[PDB]
Subunit: 639 residues, 4 copies
């Protein structure tokens, strides 16, 4: 189950303290994201496992170069200039870095999290011992990483062909102490690269044979961004899947949409797996119990089936689960590889001439799956706001009671459409815009880094959408509970006033059915308004009871005493609520987290906090990883 | 390996005789393609394996319907109207079909018969799971319609592929009930009203029973049909493109090292290892790689150490495209081998239980196809330009009069046009979901629309493959002629050095030049003193005079030049003229070259061959389009393991 | 006003008998469309006006080439091979055509309509006297055009129009391999084609091959018919927004002149809509509806109605501006080099980027028009938004076996979804082409073909919209006649049963106020809104005032005796008025009477397809312009 | 709405004052000698119901698009000069015959 795999990734992300870098131990996207996001996470470069192969490779290269062997990027020019030969070994490598320090700072940069991640991947790539880089440079990299030092890197300039040439040149730039490369030390300090190395007790390196190319010729930045993108995509996917369950509960859906047999006959692994999760989440739900009751009232006048954003959520999610899982595998494969050219095969004494394409394509695919995830959340959000489709819920989830001055989540509804519209636009592909580049030497190139940044932007928006959706659903939980409490109050007042005014058994029964049947939010605004659905039904029932008993003083008395008692008792129960079925729900951890740990309450005109203040707290908890606590809680026992 | 798997799909496509439909035996995309494209392929609905469960389900549905059980789309309305109930069971079903016969025929566009017949197959197969409630008799009629080449004329557009391809499948339903306004084709010319079609094959119109209208329209059969034949073709063309990278390496004088197993072991994307393993195997004993190594040992330090990316990075480029196309095939097959219907009758448990994968994966496959096309455009571009082609003439023009021979220039122009439209097609369809059907279908997959765009992208890829293979056979010829021409030049220069009595030092320099200068730089006029053969000869003559200085030498050099301009052009013309009326013989790509040249009856293009570039590429494209191209492909890969 | 200019284009397309090709008389998108669609339209190449300059140019080029002048594509190679020189003038031109006959026929080709339009445009370019083409070749083109002869041309291959134009050249030189159509049926090799119209294959002279192939006549040809259709369909959509307002019970106030008074397209579309609705009998019903329970009904219409003029504004501008741009390209010399014989020189430039870019813009505007139509249709199908209309516009009365226009609703979403996808740009996919000598290129033909496909879909959406709207006219008219029956029945029964003035009045109100289509299925069902309302009022009257209880019970009894039969009767009568006073009468009449349709229901045997197809065919073939012009007459 | 929120001194609305200072909206209003407004009839909607932000960004976009276009046009001339182009491509009669303005 993909649910297990993702829980495994989340647990690894939180628990790891030391990333082992040795050329055999795999780095997962959870490891990359943990280093990027938790500064207590340290790298350990293991000498006993890979120092030997590195020093052998490095020395092989330096010797071969000095004896004038004809090797690409070592004694020949780069890319389109590979026909040029030199014996100025060091000068060849330094001229490479110089030509590649060619990005520009706008008024924007790759963030520190990305840059350090790239530094991690570049270090790891060296541990396979194919690069010819010196051990010392690797130790310097490990130390730069653990000391929280990183170059400031221009956003743009990589087409990610054989490598992310320009952004990786800035890491090489820091390593050789270029004065014009600026480096961050922690969050506050910025100093030239020579001052940076000095403060952590390193000296500038002079580049040897192949070292400039080894340092720039990989796809480390794209894969860095793709790794945190893929970490986040896995978590947010599991979060979206889970909340489809919560959506069913609050919308009064039919849980049958998640029956294992519907999906066993149409067996997409992601479809089966998501249905399996949903069935489990909803199994003995106290909210489904209210749903069943709701549909038994006027059964034949209510929809037999839910709308597609609920009922076909497991089929919609299926391919999205598969896309995100396969892309995680593909990115991890890239993380755990020697991306570099030439590959040094020191054992058989050849430098091998070959080559970011896997990452570029899969980031395109994931961006389309993220767009699908946002489209599902938009459609669910839209249904929840419209009283015709929310099975009892008031429009915009406005508590009112005075609806003319309470527009509830109308603002969040508008923001949802804006989020989803930009998201769909973002999901056009990047890899279809390949230009013939670098004197036509890179006549194909992956554009992985650019595609990775767009998918990263796509996830940022999904987060916004998940934040709003979860907020709306806690609003709806509160509204359903209040609804239960209100209908009970109405039934009681009607039952007792029936006894008090001494109306026949028939009249009592007819009147109590109306109290049960009328959606309370259709008349909460003014329960004794003669034109609103409570009084409208009661009047119909009264005229009906007059005809059936034919072969009035008490009915006029019942009505009069209804507008004495009803509103006040309804107000009291609401007011009391403002200062329960969620307790038996699998989604209790989410509601408790949002309401208690974040300190929110049912939205209304009498709560001074804006929607912004409420959603922000939820967004922040999503952004920083705290949401995974209620998520793991909600999920435990699923196996 | 994906190679053996694709070889298996082609073998199944060619060899299958009968498609067994029984509710357990899997239908693959080759079966769907086989049924669509080979009318001798027959559908065999096996009663013994599934008739009994169909009748149980059928009978169960009717019984529950007549008892007034409340079951979606059986005693309730459909879609956004599911809150309406009736006991008018047959009219409920006929009213659904009526309302869905709502497409328009444009100007004439329609789903093709290949797609409609495929959809018919998939709808029949779905019914064999015994969950639908449809009568066994309706299934037999479908098998008979399929086997008799009758299909409804179906409008191109109208489906959003939510729970079903509602409008298109209403036309299959409209045929089975003999709606007179539903036109049916029988074979390729004949078109008649539905009642006449049914009579011509000995069936009578059906009266719809409970749930039967819904059963006929409520799955994603048209999108899945189109996507199946799309995935079959994607698999074939992918393999073709991978194989042709090898042939590109041979004719462009690439370095085979790009495909070495260690490069890909250290970056182990499954598609990367596997495409390279194939390429390595394809180029192992190549006589063209032999010419290549020979070419780079001449003026070694004045020549690129690496090839360009379109060659050198083809395994890395291909890897994700292989994975995309292979994973999409599995996804589409999973969809083929399912009961796409709602509600599901679970007659065993006495209950009724109430097109997305294909849309997304079609979007992904369209991106992979644009990527394959980008690879082809880039290779073809290198091949056309003398700066990047390592001895080939611009546009692969044979000449020798280049001012009146533009070679494959028109093809080059068209390749740009093909690639540009292709990159445009690869924008996603799934990002354009509208809230549909009174907001009941607020998500929908658009799978049929997406599948159609991927089909169009594949149609363009076929064009590009055809031109590329054509350009590569042109390049094979030019390489073989080049080799033969250089030998004549060497021989003539060698015999004239003797006749004229030139020193060994002079002879050495003059023979070096004849070997080193690319023949196609001076072919137009071999004795033109301003072209590279003579320039190089003149340079070496000045060098030999200066080296032998410590007269009659100049006299003999002058004689050498005079006699060269008497004899060399004639001997070069003769060898070329002879060639117009070998190393390809030792090459894994002989089957392609032999297929294009002898089986399709082509020749090296020039001003003297009267056939247009159109006429040559049309033959190759018709071969790719109709599957004949898989014979050389299978011959070429014979023995790969 | 853009509305006058569009009626001007439509008039011209209908009336033109002859296309004068003379080198100064402009060709409009309407002339191109007419030549392509009406075969009685003929080309008249006017010798007296342009033969002199063509011959002067032709001779200059021939003489200069013979003298050994260094002129691109005349004594030099083409494109990236322009460093190659030759004295072999004719062979140079023939080898260019040979190399460019490089399209493939897939299973597909440019339609004859486009191919003939390209031949027209090419002929026209030649009359400017800059090409060096011979007069004889131009006369041969006119003769080919007027005799319905045209080469079969592959769909793809131009980055913009070397390959496709090479097939026109191949016809003229009688290449065996080039296939020509003659009318609808006959297909023969080019040499046979020329023979049949009494022509001989040409031997190309200096610059001739290049002159025949070196401009963008195909992209411009497709662009021209595309722009003609976009103007016509634009005006159709604008007009039908007015018909949508009538059937949906919208508020005409959205079209008031001061709101907009000022994007020209915004002012002008509003000005049209205001006029179309000024004396509408349907707006009279709308006002009446909104005065019934005013404070319980929306104050504003939804955006797809209320903001239609603002939506349409940039769409009008885009289509109008693109039209001007295509016409500029039509009335130009696209060729290179440009021979300026007057001053004894050849001019080496690049005369089609304008068309590529604007086709991308227009494809976006067409997508925009479609979204509007989708949004209106959607509203119309949903009872919550249609102001009294039944869901799916289903007549019933048995809604459980009548799904009305639901199939059309579904189709509309498919249409719109595909349309939005199409509207992505083409010009952003420029590849570095032709040995990198065409490192920019416009892709105009490809873009034009995409916009053409986008219009195809818009026609589908308009045909469905117009069908829904006539369904909606019938339902409103039936609504009004049905409400009067209920009012009469309630009224006379109140008398017969002798209820007071108070009761009669409350019951009359309910009959007036309750939306009929909420109870038509079973008017006397106690759970449906009519009897729910009457029971509320009867209880009210009992309190505010016996044997009255007797008279009410008899009222309720005689209602399920009289009511359903009389409602059934008017509907049955209707299936076997306010539209008569509406500007939109010609559309309703055209669809109902001229196309022979009727209100859709379970009792009408025609499928939705049968109905919409007729409306589509009429849109596709231009008959829709007859009602369009009738509806618009008097608008100034 | 953030502009309206400032004008009415919402504490949750932060305001910028120059480059350095960020303060809650009531303290922002205080410093410029202004007091929170109490919204009267239609003032809320009048403040939010227009397309002022889109048009604002669109305005700085169009200004820049004009400047950069002219700069691109001008730099084609510079490219001609350094690449050894033929200036004949800009001769007026070529373009008079294809008169896109």
């Amino acid at each position: 189950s993909h649910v297990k795999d993702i829980l495994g990734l989340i647990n690894a992300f939180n628990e790891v303290k030391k990333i082992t870098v040795d050329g055999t131990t795999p780095i997962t996207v959870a490891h990359v994201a943990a280093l990027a996001r938790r500064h207590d996470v340290k790298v350990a470069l293991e000498a006993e496992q890979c120092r030997a192969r590195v020093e052998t490779c490095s020395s092989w290269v330096q010797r071969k170069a000095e004896d004038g062997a004809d090797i690409y990027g070592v004694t020949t020019g780069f890319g389109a200039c590979s026909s040029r030969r030199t014996n100025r070994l060091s000068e060849l490598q330094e001229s490479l870095i110089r030509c590649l320090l060619a990005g520009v700072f706008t008024k924007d940069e790759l963030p520190a999290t990305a840059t350090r991640s790239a530094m991690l991947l570049r270090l790891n790539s060296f541990t396979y011992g194919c690069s010819g880089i010196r051990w010392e440079v690797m130790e310097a990299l490990e130390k730069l990483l653990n000391s929280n030092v990183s170059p400031k890197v221009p956003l743009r300039g990589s087409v990610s062909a054989s490598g992310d040439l320009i952004p990786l040149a800035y890491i090489a730039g820091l390593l050789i102490g270029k004065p014009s490369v600026i480096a961050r030390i922690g969050d506050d300090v910025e100093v030239p690269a020579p001052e940076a190395l000095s403060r952590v007790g390193l000296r500038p390196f002079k580049l040897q044979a192949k070292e400039g190319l080894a340092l720039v010729n990989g796809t480390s930045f794209a894969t860095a961004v793709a790794s945190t993108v893929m970490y986040d995509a896995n978590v947010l996917l599991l979060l979206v899947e889970t909340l489809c369950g919560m959506f069913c509960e609050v919308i009064f859906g039919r849980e049958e949409f998640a029956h294992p047999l519907i999906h066993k006959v149409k067996p997409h692994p992601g479809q089966i797996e998501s249905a399996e999760l949903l069935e489990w989440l909803l199994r003995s739900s106290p909210f489904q119990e209210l749903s069943r009751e709701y549909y038994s009232i006027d059964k034949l006048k209510k929809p037999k089936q839910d709308r597609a954003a609920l009922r076909s959520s497991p089929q919609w999610l299926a391919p999205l689960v598969q896309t995100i899982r396969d892309a995680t595998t593909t990115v991890e494969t890239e993380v755990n590889s020697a991306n570099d050219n030439p590959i040094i095969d020191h054992a058989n004494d050849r430098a091998l001439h070959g080559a970011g394409s896997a990452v570029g394509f899969y980031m395109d695919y994931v961006r389309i799956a993220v767009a699908g995830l946002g489209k599902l959340l938009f459609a669910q959000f839209t249904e929840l706001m419209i009283e015709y489709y929310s099975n009892g819920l008031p429009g915009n989830l406005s508590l009112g009671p005075d609806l003319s001055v309470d527009y509830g989540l109308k603002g969040l509804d508008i923001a949802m459409a804006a989020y989803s519209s930009e998201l769909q636009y973002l999901a056009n592909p990047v890899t279809t815009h390949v230009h013939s580049a670098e004197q036509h030497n890179q006549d194909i190139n992956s554009l992985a880094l650019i595609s990775a940044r767009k998918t990263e932007e796509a996830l940022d928006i999904l987060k916004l959408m998940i934040a709003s959706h979860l907020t709306a659903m806690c609003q709806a939980v509160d509204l359903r509970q209040l609804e239960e409490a209100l209908v009970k109050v109405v039934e009681n007042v009607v039952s007792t006033l029936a006894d008090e005014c001494g109306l026949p058994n028939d009249t009592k029964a007819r009147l109590l059915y109306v109290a049960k049947a009328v959606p309370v939010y259709t008349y909460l605004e003014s329960p004794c308004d003669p034109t609103l659905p409570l009084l409208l039904g009661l009047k119909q029932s009264c005229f009906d009871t007059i005809l059936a008993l034919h072969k009035v003083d008490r009915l006029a008395e019942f009505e009069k005493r209804l507008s004495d008692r009803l509103e006040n008792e309804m107000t009291a129960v609401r007011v009391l609520y403002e200062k329960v079925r969620i307790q038996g729900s699998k989604f209790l951890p989410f509601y408790r987290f949002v309401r208690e740990e974040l300190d929110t309450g049912v939205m209304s005109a009498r709560r001074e906090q804006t929607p912004q203040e409420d959603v922000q707290k939820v967004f922040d908890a999503i952004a920083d990883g705290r949401i995974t606590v209620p998520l793991l809680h909600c999920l435990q026992g699923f196996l």
